[PDB]
Amino acid sequence: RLKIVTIHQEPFVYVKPTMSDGTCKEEFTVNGDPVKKVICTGVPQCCYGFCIDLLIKLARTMNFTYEVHLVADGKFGTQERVNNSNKKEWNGMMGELLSGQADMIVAPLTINNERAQYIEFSKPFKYQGLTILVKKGTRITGINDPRLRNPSDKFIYATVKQSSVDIYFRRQVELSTMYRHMEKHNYESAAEAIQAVRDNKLHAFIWDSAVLEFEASQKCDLVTTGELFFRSGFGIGMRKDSPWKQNVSLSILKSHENGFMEDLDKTWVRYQEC
Numbered sequence: 006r007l008k009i010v011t012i013h014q015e016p017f018v019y020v021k022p023t024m025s026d027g028t029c030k031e032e033f034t035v036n037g038d039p040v041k042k043v044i045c046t047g048v049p050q051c052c053y054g055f056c057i058d059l060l061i062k063l064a065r066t067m068n069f070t071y072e073v074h075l076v077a078d079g080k081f082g083t084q085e086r087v088n089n090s091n092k093k094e095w096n097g098m099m100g101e102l103l104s105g106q107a108d109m110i111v112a113p114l115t116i117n118n119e120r121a122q123y124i125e126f127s128k129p130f131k132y133q134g135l136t137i138l139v140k141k142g143t144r145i146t147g148i149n150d151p152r153l154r155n156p157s158d159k160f161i162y163a164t165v166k167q168s169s170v171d172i173y174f175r176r177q178v179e180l181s182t183m184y185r186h187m188e189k190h191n192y193e194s195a196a197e198a199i200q201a202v203r204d205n206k207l208h209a210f211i212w213d214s215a216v217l218e219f220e221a222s223q224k225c226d227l228v229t230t231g232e233l234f235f236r237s238g239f240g241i242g243m244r245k246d247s248p249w250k251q252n253v254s255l256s257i258l259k260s261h262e263n264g265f266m267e268d269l270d271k272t273w274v275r276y277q278e279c
């Protein structure tokens with residue numbers, strides 16, 4: 006069985022406890038359909054969501070058995086220094102895939118050149134990017150809006166401390182002005198930041214576009230605004246010498262063409278009524 010590694014990241018992967026009898030609660034979408042779930046260890050737990058639906062579709066069309074587990078260190082994966090040395094090694098899911106603890110990463114893993122040098126990405130199953138969350142009525146054109154480009158205590162914007170977004174802004178010389186402002190207001194978690202916008206304590210939250218659209222679709226007082234920026238995509242991760250490489254991509258392309266990927270978006274991200 007293929008060792009699948011994933012991570013808790015709503016709405017792509019939800020993680021909940023099993024019921025008293027060890028099974029996963031039978032639930033259904035507002036649409037009325039049965040929610041597909043799988044046991045993922047990390048203690049057996051219940052995993053479901055956009056990427057789980059995708060894994061199932063792949064497992065079925067490619068005919069392969071699998072077992073899912075949650076990444077041990079709870080990280081997506083970046084190259085960090087080990088034991089106070091200059092030697093660096095991948096942590097998170099990147100690290101588990103390279104070490105053999107996993108044979109495939111199924112999660113919203115952002116595609117980028119640094120990672121592509123060590124592993125192989127399938128064709129993107131969904132595009133990725135950042136957007137801005139604000140309270141309904143607030144007007145912001147995007148990352149180039151005046152109130153973002155020229156910071157002041159009058160309009161507070163931020164992201165999550167030590168997150169991929171925070172690290173990205175910190176490394177861009179061109180964003181130094183925005184970063185100096187953000188570092189003063191960054192939050193401990195995305196949940197707290199989102200709540201701060203609802204409570205009018207944070208005026209704008211910069212974060213993953215799918216996550217923010219998910220939030221806006223359920224909370225009437227919140228909306229995303231401006232054009233998506235710093236784009237890329239999410240892909241399935243596998244070692245370079247993987248035998249499922251071409252087959253995973255061919256399947257993803259077919260799912261794009263037949264409307265399946267859009268169906269997943271409608272189900273897990275774009276909710277009807279807020």
Ligand SMILES: O=C(O)c1cc(O)c2c(Cl)cc(Cl)cc2n1
Nearest residue numbers: 014081113114115168169213215
């Ligand atoms: O490093 C990553 O791949 C990464 C990192 C992140 O921080 C991600 C967030 Cl908030 C949301 C989603 Cl849907 C995917 C994310 N991926």
